[PDB]
Write a protein that binds this DNA or RNA. Structure first.
Length: 196
DNA sequence: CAGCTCTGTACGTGAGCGATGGACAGCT
DNA sequence: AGCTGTCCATCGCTCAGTACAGAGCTG
């Protein structure tokens, strides 16, 4: 990577971008190598996240990874990951690491209490749900989940991973429906608030 | 049996690498 | 004309979670 070794990138981490009063926190799986290299969220040239963000109207212009620190203030969006360690890919991670991350995640969510905790990836919500709600469903579905983060009013919303690894949703276009519904949910919650 | 859970197989786009070689201009 | 090098268009290839069958388990 411009002359920087994998071995070096393995040791890097990607900072959280979290604040109070967010509408959405996007929870990724863990940093991949390019994220680790850049120090910004979703830099992968083929990752769908920033495309979908724009295509859905969650951003009104096309942003990119370098804009990540602006999201909280301008767009009501922050970022973290279930697991902090950089890996060549998601199956390098162990169950213990995922469960550690889950515990840490829930404490962060309890602290910052966004309106919506967005799991960028079904696999990390499968783990979080078992660990946190004790629920392992036959057929976990995407979209809104029927549980709040414990002790909070923060909702849990699941999307297919923005990674272009999954074949079932081969293009950004095939994921954008979930981003549009996420936008709808945010707008509904703000409506309820305005009207109490 | 029947419902779990656990493990390994199989899967579509599009971005960007290195390799390759066609177009072309500078020089003789 | 003939030779030679750069530029750049293009190619082939690689590669960035999810669904599900079946084996194992256990009530």
């Amino acid at each position: 990577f411009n002359g920087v070794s994998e071995a070096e990138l393995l040791t890097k981490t990607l900072p959280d971008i979290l604040t109070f009063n967010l509408d959405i926190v996007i929870i990724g799986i863990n940093p991949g190598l390019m994220a680790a290299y850049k120090g910004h969220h979703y830099p992968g040239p083929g990752n769908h996240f920033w495309k979908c963000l724009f295509m859905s109207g969650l951003s009104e212009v096309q942003l990119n990874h370098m804009d990540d620190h602006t999201l909280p203030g301008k767009y009501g969006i922050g970022f973290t990951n279930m697991v902090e360690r950089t890996t060549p890919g998601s199956k390098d991670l162990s169950s213990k690491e995922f469960r550690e991350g889950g515990r840490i995640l829930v404490q962060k969510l309890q602290k910052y209490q966004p309106r919506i905790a967005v799991f960028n990836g079904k696999c990390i919500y499968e783990i979080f749900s078992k660990e946190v709600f004790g629920v392992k469903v036959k057929n976990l579905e995407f979209g809104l989940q029927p549980h709040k983060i414990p002790d909070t009013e923060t909702l849990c919303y699941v999307m297919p991973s923005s990674s272009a690894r999954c074949a079932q949703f081969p293009r950004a276009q095939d994921k954008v429906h979930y981003y549009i519904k996420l936008k709808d949910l945010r707008d509904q919650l703000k409506g309820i608030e305005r009207n109490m």
